[PDB]
Amino acid sequence: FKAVADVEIDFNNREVLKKYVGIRDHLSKEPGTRGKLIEALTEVLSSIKAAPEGSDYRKAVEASCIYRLKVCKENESDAAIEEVLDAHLEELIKEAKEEARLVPLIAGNAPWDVPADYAVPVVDYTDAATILDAP
Amino acid sequence: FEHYLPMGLEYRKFSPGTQPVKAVVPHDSPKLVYDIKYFVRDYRRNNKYTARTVDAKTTFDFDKLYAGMPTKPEQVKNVTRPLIMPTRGY
Amino acid sequence: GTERRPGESGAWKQIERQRYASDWENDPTFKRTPKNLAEVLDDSASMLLLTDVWRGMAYTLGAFFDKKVTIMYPFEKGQLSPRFRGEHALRRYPTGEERCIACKLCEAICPAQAITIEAEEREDGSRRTTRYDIDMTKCIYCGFCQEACPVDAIVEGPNFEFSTETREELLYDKQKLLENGDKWETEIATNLRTESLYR
Amino acid sequence: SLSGYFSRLLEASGKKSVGSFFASWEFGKMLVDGNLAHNVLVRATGAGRLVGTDYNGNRYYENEEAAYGRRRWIVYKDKFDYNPTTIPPEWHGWLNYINDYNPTNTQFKQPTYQIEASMTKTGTQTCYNPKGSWFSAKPRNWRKYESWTP
Amino acid sequence: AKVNNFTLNFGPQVLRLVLEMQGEIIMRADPHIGLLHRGTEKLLEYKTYLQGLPYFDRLDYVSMMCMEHSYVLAIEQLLNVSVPLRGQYIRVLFSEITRVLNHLLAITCHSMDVGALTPFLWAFEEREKLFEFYERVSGARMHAAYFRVGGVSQDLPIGLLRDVYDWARQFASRLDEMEELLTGNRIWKERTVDVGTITAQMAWDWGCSGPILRASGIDWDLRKTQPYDAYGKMQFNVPIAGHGDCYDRYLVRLQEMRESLRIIYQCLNEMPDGLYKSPDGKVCPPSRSTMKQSMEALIHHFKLYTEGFHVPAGETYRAVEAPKGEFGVYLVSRGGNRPYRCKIRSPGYAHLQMTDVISRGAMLADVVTIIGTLDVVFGEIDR
Amino acid sequence: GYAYARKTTDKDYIASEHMQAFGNTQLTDYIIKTVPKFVKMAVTGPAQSSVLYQEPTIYTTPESLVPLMVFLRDHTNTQFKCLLDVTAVDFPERAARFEVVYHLLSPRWNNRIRVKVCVDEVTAVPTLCKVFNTANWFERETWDMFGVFFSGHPDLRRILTDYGFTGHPLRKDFPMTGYQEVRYDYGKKRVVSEPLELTQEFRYFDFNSPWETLNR
Amino acid sequence: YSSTLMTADKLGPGGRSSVSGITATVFGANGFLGSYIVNELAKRGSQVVCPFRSTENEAMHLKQMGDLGQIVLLPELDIRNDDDIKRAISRSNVIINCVGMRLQTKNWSFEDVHVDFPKRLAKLAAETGQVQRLIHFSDMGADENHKSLRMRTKAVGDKEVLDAFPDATIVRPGDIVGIEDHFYNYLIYQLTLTVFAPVVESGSNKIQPTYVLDVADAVAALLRKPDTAGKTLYLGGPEVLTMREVYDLLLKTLRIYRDDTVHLPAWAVKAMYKPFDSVRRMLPGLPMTSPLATEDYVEEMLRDKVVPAGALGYADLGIVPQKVTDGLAIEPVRHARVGGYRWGDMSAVAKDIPESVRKYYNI
Amino acid sequence: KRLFGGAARHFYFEICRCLPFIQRLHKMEEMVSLKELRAIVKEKFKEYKDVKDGRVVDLLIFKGREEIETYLLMHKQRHHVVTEVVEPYYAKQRAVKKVTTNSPFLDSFLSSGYAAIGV
Amino acid sequence: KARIYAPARTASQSGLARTVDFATTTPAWKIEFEPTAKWQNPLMGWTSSADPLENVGRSALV
Numbered sequence A: 001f002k003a004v005a006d007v008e009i010d011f012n013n014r015e016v017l018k019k020y021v022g023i024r025d026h027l028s029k030e031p032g033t034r035g036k037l038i039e040a041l042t043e044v045l046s047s048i049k050a051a052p053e054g055s056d057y058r059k060a061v062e063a064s065c066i067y068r069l070k071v072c073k074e075n076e077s078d079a080a081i082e083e084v085l086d087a088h089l090e091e092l093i094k095e096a097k098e099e100a101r102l103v104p105l106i107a108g109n110a111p112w113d114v115p116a117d118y119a120v121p122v123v124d125y126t127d128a129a130t131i132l133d134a135p
Numbered sequence B: 001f002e003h004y005l006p007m008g009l010e011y012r013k014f015s016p017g018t019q020p021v022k023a024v025v026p027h028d029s030p031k032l033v034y035d036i037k038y039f040v041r042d043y044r045r046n047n048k049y050t051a052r053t054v055d056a057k058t059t060f061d062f063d064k065l066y067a068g069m070p071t072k073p074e075q076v077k078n079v080t081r082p083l084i085m086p087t088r089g090y
Numbered sequence C: 001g002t003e004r005r006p007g008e009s010g011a012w013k014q015i016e017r018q019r020y021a022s023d024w025e026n027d028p029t030f031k032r033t034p035k036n037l038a039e040v041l042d043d044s045a046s047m048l049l050l051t052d053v054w055r056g057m058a059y060t061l062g063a064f065f066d067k068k069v070t071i072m073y074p075f076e077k078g079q080l081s082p083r084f085r086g087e088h089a090l091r092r093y094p095t096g097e098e099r100c101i102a103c104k105l106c107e108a109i110c111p112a113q114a115i116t117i118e119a120e121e122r123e124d125g126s127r128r129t130t131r132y133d134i135d136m137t138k139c140i141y142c143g144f145c146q147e148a149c150p151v152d153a154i155v156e157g158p159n160f161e162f163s164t165e166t167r168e169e170l171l172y173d174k175q176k177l178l179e180n181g182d183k184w185e186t187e188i189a190t191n192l193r194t195e196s197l198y199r
Numbered sequence D: 001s002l003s004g005y006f007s008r009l010l011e012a013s014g015k016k017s018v019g020s021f022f023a024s025w026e027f028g029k030m031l032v033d034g035n036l037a038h039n040v041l042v043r044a045t046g047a048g049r050l051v052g053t054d055y056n057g058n059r060y061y062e063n064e065e066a067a068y069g070r071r072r073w074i075v076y077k078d079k080f081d082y083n084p085t086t087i088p089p090e091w092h093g094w095l096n097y098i099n100d101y102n103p104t105n106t107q108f109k110q111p112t113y114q115i116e117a118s119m120t121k122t123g124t125q126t127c128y129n130p131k132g133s134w135f136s137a138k139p140r141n142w143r144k145y146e147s148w149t150p
Numbered sequence E: 001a002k003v004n005n006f007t008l009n010f011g012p013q014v015l016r017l018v019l020e021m022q023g024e025i026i027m028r029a030d031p032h033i034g035l036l037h038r039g040t041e042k043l044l045e046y047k048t049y050l051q052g053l054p055y056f057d058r059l060d061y062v063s064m065m066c067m068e069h070s071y072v073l074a075i076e077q078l079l080n081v082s083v084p085l086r087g088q089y090i091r092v093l094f095s096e097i098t099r100v101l102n103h104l105l106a107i108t109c110h111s112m113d114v115g116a117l118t119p120f121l122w123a124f125e126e127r128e129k130l131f132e133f134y135e136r137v138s139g140a141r142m143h144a145a146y147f148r149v150g151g152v153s154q155d156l157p158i159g160l161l162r163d164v165y166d167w168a169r170q171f172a173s174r175l176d177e178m179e180e181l182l183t184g185n186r187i188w189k190e191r192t193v194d195v196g197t198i199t200a201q202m203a204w205d206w207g208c209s210g211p212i213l214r215a216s217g218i219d220w221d222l223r224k225t226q227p228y229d230a231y232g233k234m235q236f237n238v239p240i241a242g243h244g245d246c247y248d249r250y251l252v253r254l255q256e257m258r259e260s261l262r263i264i265y266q267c268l269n270e271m272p273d274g275l276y277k278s279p280d281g282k283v284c285p286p287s288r289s290t291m292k293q294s295m296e297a298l299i300h301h302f303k304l305y306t307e308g309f310h311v312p313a314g315e316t317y318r319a320v321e322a323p324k325g326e327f328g329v330y331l332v333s334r335g336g337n338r339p340y341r342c343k344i345r346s347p348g349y350a351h352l353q354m355t356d357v358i359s360r361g362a363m364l365a366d367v368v369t370i371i372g373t374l375d376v377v378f379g380e381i382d383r
Numbered sequence F: 001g002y003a004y005a006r007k008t009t010d011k012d013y014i015a016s017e018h019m020q021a022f023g024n025t026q027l028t029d030y031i032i033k034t035v036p037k038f039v040k041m042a043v044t045g046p047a048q049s050s051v052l053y054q055e056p057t058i059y060t061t062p063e064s065l066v067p068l069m070v071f072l073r074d075h076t077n078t079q080f081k082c083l084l085d086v087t088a089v090d091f092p093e094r095a096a097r098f099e100v101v102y103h104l105l106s107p108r109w110n111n112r113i114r115v116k117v118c119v120d121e122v123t124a125v126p127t128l129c130k131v132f133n134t135a136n137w138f139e140r141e142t143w144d145m146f147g148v149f150f151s152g153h154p155d156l157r158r159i160l161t162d163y164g165f166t167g168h169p170l171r172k173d174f175p176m177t178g179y180q181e182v183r184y185d186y187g188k189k190r191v192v193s194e195p196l197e198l199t200q201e202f203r204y205f206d207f208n209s210p211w212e213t214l215n216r
Numbered sequence G: 001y002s003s004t005l006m007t008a009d010k011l012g013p014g015g016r017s018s019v020s021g022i023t024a025t026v027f028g029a030n031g032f033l034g035s036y037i038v039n040e041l042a043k044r045g046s047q048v049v050c051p052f053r054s055t056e057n058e059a060m061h062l063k064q065m066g067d068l069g070q071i072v073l074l075p076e077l078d079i080r081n082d083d084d085i086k087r088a089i090s091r092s093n094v095i096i097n098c099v100g101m102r103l104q105t106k107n108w109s110f111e112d113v114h115v116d117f118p119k120r121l122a123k124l125a126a127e128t129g130q131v132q133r134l135i136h137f138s139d140m141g142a143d144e145n146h147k148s149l150r151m152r153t154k155a156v157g158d159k160e161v162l163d164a165f166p167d168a169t170i171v172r173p174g175d176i177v178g179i180e181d182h183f184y185n186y187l188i189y190q191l192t193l194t195v196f197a198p199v200v201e202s203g204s205n206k207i208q209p210t211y212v213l214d215v216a217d218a219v220a221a222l223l224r225k226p227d228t229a230g231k232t233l234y235l236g237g238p239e240v241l242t243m244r245e246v247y248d249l250l251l252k253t254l255r256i257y258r259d260d261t262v263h264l265p266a267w268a269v270k271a272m273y274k275p276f277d278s279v280r281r282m283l284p285g286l287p288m289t290s291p292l293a294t295e296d297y298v299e300e301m302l303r304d305k306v307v308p309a310g311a312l313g314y315a316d317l318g319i320v321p322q323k324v325t326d327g328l329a330i331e332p333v334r335h336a337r338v339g340g341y342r343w344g345d346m347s348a349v350a351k352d353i354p355e356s357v358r359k360y361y362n363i
Numbered sequence H: 001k002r003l004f005g006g007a008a009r010h011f012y013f014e015i016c017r018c019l020p021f022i023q024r025l026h027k028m029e030e031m032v033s034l035k036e037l038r039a040i041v042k043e044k045f046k047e048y049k050d051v052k053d054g055r056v057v058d059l060l061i062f063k064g065r066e067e068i069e070t071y072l073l074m075h076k077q078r079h080h081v082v083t084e085v086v087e088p089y090y091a092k093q094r095a096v097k098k099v100t101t102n103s104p105f106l107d108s109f110l111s112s113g114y115a116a117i118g119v
Numbered sequence I: 001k002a003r004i005y006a007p008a009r010t011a012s013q014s015g016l017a018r019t020v021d022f023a024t025t026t027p028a029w030k031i032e033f034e035p036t037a038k039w040q041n042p043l044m045g046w047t048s049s050a051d052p053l054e055n056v057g058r059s060a061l062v
């Protein structure tokens, strides 16, 4: 990106970059770390147990959390987790906290409680260039 | 410092009604002057909508979805931005 | 410069924040505290004795002694192109016969519905209009009628100076549009000799 | 040269002497209309050359050393009621910078039905009016049928 | 004590505002709109697709061709029409000229509302130059109707790129002399710094887009994330600030003018030779010489200028990075030659909804600064 | 609050391969499998984000619009933070003639989605003001233009039409020119509304070919 | 002729775009009553021709009143020239005369305006053959045996009009109230803006004022009914009042707590108004001169101006006239009270008003 | 006991409470009284006395509410009340048993070839 | 009063797309109203009307 300030800013220092884009003032003044991401993801893994075992929602949340924790485990520096998960760690901790917050509302609504012969029609679109252009 | 208000003949030297060179504008491709068949390029009327089989007892495996994701900074692959929209050769 | 100061902050929450906490010293867009005597004198010569007002004043005084961009209408005019969409007009062949053949394509394409056409066959068998109205107060001056015409009968000419005192003077019938074409024919033909290379 | 200035002033105003110029009603309106005053006294007497004259009497000047879009100007012959609707269409595209053609360098094709340019008639009672108007010689009732008269 | 709010009516003369104050501090702002609601969404159902195109010039009438772009792209997607390369380059070039015009007007009208009168008069002569560029290719200074389904309406006249290069050679000097009056001035800073702050969470929660979104530290440009025409080939930067200030939005808008100049220079050097219209004759009308010499061209000219093409049944939403944010069209097709439903999404409608939460804690003399920095035009707000 | 400026270099890429593949291919099946009771119908079509892809459309009941939108905002794989608009489409041939349409944008993964609810004239739709703050003015406009009542709204009042305007103009049975028109009366010294009279009535041109195949 | 005027060419339901079939010439169309008559005719789809003598700025308000082509404006009217009168009526089947005068001038006398011009107008109207109706306006107090000159010249001109055009209708309304009238406006300018207001004698002479919209409706009702041709109608409101009662009503309505009027003998009032009546000629006419500062007004104040017994009035036209003392007619004089019109405290009735309304009005 | 929760009479009571402030603000003190205004607003309510659906009742009450605040906030003036509320009522109760023995058909016949549209 | 009907094929052409033959594919049933008064504009001759339902059934309701 281009910085509109006429002064020279380093931006290799990651704390300066987090200050300049307003992460400190507007999202989280406390710096997010790898341990806080691990704690938040384990909070999600504890919170999802209110969903039934056979539900696809629980499997989806658990698989996402397990992949995130494996990324956290195999990478020690927080810049590596930033480069893998394509965000700032403050964003990722907020994502995990929001995912943990979501669980009681979904569990109260119970979307998994459909009949056994539940049916959803789907209509898909095929482009003309599939049959007109070269295979 | 470049000056606003250029002087005589330094800007719009010729009026658009007195263009100094005659213009030859292409209005057709040379590939279509003598090859005029239309049904081989009827993209408008050849798109399809198909009703899928009823999405009930399918098998969403999350293991395969999360098994294709990277875990290290290198081995992350990114989709490059498309340079142009499709022109179909024209 | 784009630098910030504690005190030049336009609001109150940030004014209260800068005078009770040193969080502004972490932000890289702020100007730092002067460290020695000469820096204090530079900061005071910035705040007192202005010198930021004076740069704008020097620029506007340079503009006072510079050149001007005003044209003396109506002794001097602006600049337009042969594609310019002005007052509508009806055209003839060089013989003197009307080009229009009452196809009603310009009436069909008109998004404003500003055209009203009636026709019958002339006494020599020709297909010609008996009514051709253009409501100039309904027209949007798009030029779509000029594009739809297959015989170049209706055009938008190069005239833009046609303001009137009554609105009834802006409901053009067929005779006035032919009179406009008879007035502007040579200019319209000169414009169309260039614009036919592109259209 | 002030002799050049006065010769330019006399050829632009169309008068015969400075005494005839300063004692005219045209100079009286140039004391109260500053747009005409600037055009006659400053622009027409400056650097530039005369290009041509139309049939309404207006003179056309140009200066290639000027800024773009201020190279061409007109001196209207009607000093008291000057109007741009008296410019003929063969000078209109030159003065509006649409093309570089005028009668002094281009022979236009003249149609046999061409109506010459004259001043607008708006605000007077000889303006254009539609055929259903009160000001027409015979107003039209636009009925599309014929009534039975016994 | 039990202080009731003092209310105020702010202008019939087309924004109407009903404020509440607790002294000199505003507690509430309620905009009343619809004074320019002309019902263009209903009128588009009674037009063919070519007939309804000049309605879009009159939505954001500071930025015309960008409004045309999204409607054209929405039609082209359902029609499955490809645009040739030269037409894509022309569309990108005139979209960036349009963005320069809009940002000139927005910054100088804002600075005139604050009190600085000279930058308005300095920038409008540059606006006149870009209006001459519009007129030389379309014959209209503002409502061009230039972008069409499958390309552009006419080719570029010979001699246009020469003059666009001559304008772009001095535009940076004009932007430089513009900033000498405003950027390092204490009165402008004291009017604009920390006024109407927008954070990222509030920006996404309130549907913001455009230079508001970039001044709150969000890297989101539709010309780089979801590119359209030849914008993926263009090399330019996204300006980023991090306070969410009026001052930061002003700086972001100036830098966006610089980047638009960069894209304009790149388009002037890579302009290709070739077709500017799609060669599908059942969508695009033929040339006027072809129409007067072949029977199929005359039939297609007759039918395309009366009934128009039939768009296949379906729906789409297509958006463009308009100079005020994201401008989008939701087109619903039943199969006819007329749109069944055409919803118009305007960014200024969402930006004006925020005035209740942005003007809280501000004074009466900062309302006009907030309205000016949101960059609102009521044609697109009131459809 | 996402898509913070992180890379200081120029990026020549959009998204990652795995997440773009998931969003462009698997998102319909994912949403159907995780929350099946919320979804009644799905369409995967020509992609709001770009001409090159496909994107889903989700049909839901009004009883579960709010939980589905909360799930689509807060779930870790579907982070649809921005609500771009709310509108309606009138289908007078149906038993429930209105389709309320919600467009969403995900800044985290460069995605878009569309959500539809079918109701008639007298069935309320739950408001999304608590989920998205822009839902206020869009629901006010939808009530103004179509007469769709949004229950639980803080202040559902008309926003676009005239002050005394009864009637919903974007319905198919509402006339284009309306019923009333406006003029100044010298006798009453007031601007007065009167029944409609037109000097030239609107000419409707019926262009549609009896050979055309695409009309649906 | 009978009722073919209102039925034979009537096209459309009767709005601005419809056609009534009436082409009318209104003389004095820019005046107080003429503007309301021109509005009444043009709003129903009639073509109205309006000649005028004044500048175009004072006639521009008539341009709005009708659709495109239906208001015709003819400036530089000279009523001593028959060519202007002939051109203005050359297509009209209805002529309405609202030309009148209140003070004499060195260029125009009462006979020139009330006698000579109505006679020549009636003659030129009868010459055309297509004029089916001539509506001439006179005063309720018009009398050939009146000491006031304007009443006498008005009655003489009424006789000349009924002589030359035998089916012309003569209309004689009372005092006309309105926003731009010459009755309450000069009385309010007499109660305020002067050190004292003279009242002629005891102020016990009776008048019958009427509303301007009722007179405008009366013209259209006359044009409907064929029996009213050749007749004379007196237009007066539903209440008979004395001048003292009118002054008391104005002083109560204006909320003035000091009666500045003084009752004076008629010779004293005439002695006051005599110096500015012997100099009324050799002068082109001065602004802000009251029409009540003449001896003719003093002679009018010594007589009753009411509807005569057995005369044709509003009831024969089917019109119930509106009250003049209260309602919409008295609202303009309520705007000139001390301080302003205003609502009040507005708090007794705002008790059970909803939430946002009280805060909106800051109650 | 009262159909659909008695919401019609509750809304009527709310409008009747709101009415004297309307009369003061719109300066209708010498034009209509509160008794005849209450009777007129009551006559607006009886036109939908045969609605069999509670959702239609709720929508009608919501729309009538929005009408009453657009009258409260001076967005329609006194001439709007005259031309829309009280003169239609006085026309519907003034033409009853007219002084002429013409049927409604014959008045319609003499007026125009077609029925009148609107008011 | 309204009329519910499906319009017949035009005599000038042979195609059947706007008929009740393709009723399940395309909406073909219409709602139409009786005409009300029309007259000519005195100034221009344009056709005037006071009918609000003059084109709403024939353009929009299928």
Ligand SMILES: NC(=O)C1=CN([C@@H]2O[C@H](COP(=O)(O)OP(=O)(O)OC[C@H]3O[C@@H](n4cnc5c(N)ncnc54)[C@H](OP(=O)(O)O)[C@@H]3O)[C@@H](O)[C@H]2O)C=CC1
Pocket (backbone or CB within 6 Å): G027, G028, G029, G030, G031, G032, G033, G034, G052, G053, G054, G077, G079, G097, G098, G099, G100, G101, G108, G113, G137, G138, G139, G140, G172, G173, G174, G175, G176, G177, G182, G183
């Ligand atoms: N209460 C009342 O006012 C009553 C009025 N009338 C009659 O009704 C008519 C309308 O009166 P009102 O409108 O109140 O009075 P106004 O003065 O307002 O109207 C008189 C009109 O006649 C025109 N006029 C006067 N003298 C001449 C002239 N010499 N040549 C050409 N035009 C002339 C005036 O035009 P300009 O503007 O150029 O002067 C003006 O438009 C009057 O004629 C009056 O006699 C009768 C009874 C009561």
Ligand code: SF4
Pocket (backbone or CB within 6 Å): C088, C109, C110, C111, C112, C113, C114, C115, C134, C138, C139, C140, C141, C142, C143, C144, C145, C146, C156
């Ligand atoms: S230019 Fe446009 S508005 Fe004017 S007549 Fe032609 S199509 Fe109609």
Ligand code: SF4
Pocket (backbone or CB within 6 Å): C099, C100, C101, C102, C103, C104, C105, C106, C107, C117, C148, C149, C150, C151, C152, C153, C154
């Ligand atoms: S002007 Fe041209 S398009 Fe219009 S009716 Fe005549 S020939 Fe046809």
